[PDB]
Amino acid sequence: ADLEDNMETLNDNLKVIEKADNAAQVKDALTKMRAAALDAQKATPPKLEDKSPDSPEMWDFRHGFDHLVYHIDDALKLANEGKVKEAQAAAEQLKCHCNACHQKYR
Numbered sequence: 719a720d721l722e723d724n725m726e727t728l729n730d731n732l733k734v735i736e737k738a739d740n741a742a743q744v745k746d747a748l749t750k751m752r753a754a755a756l757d758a759q760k761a762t763p764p765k766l767e768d769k770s771p772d773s774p775e776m777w778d779f780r781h782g783f784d785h786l787v788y789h790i791d792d793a794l795k796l797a798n799e800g801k802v803k804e805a806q807a808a809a810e811q812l813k814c815h816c817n818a819c820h821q822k823y824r
């Protein structure tokens with residue numbers, strides 16, 4: 719999918735997590751976010767289209783998604799333990815990273 723679509727998936731599923739009634743619902747949303755993060759990691763964002771594919775900026779962009787997956791995996795572990803509120807709280811740690819990448823590269 720394109721980068722915009724993967725971003726919509728990330729945004730929509732974070733809202734699902736916030737409104738969830740159980741940890742399995744959180745897990746289902748996080749699973750979709752994990753895939754969207756890894757698919758977005760394959761894209762070249764418009765603001766970096768003129769940079770080398772091997773540039774420090776492109777590696778920083780790609781590594782931002784690895785860190786999003788770090789947080790998603792943290793939250794998934796908690797969700798799979800049935801810990802709904804803790805999994806929701808772990809997912810909120812994503813937000814600073816959504817905004818930090820946007821500040822650089824959106």
Ligand code: HEC
Nearest residue numbers: 722725728729763779782783786812815816819820823824
């Ligand atoms: C870089 C490592 C990113 C991370 C982490 C997140 N996003 Fe992102 N997002 C990124 C870029 C470069 C762009 C612009 C894409 C473009 O083609 O202009 C975006 C955009 C969004 C949007 C707007 C969607 C659109 O239709 O353009 C949303 C709603 C969005 N991003 C959400 C979002 C969330 C919730 C994230 C954390 C869970 C997140 N992004 C991380 C780059 C990066």
Ligand SMILES: [Cu+2]
Nearest residue numbers: 785789811815
């Ligand atoms: Cu972090």
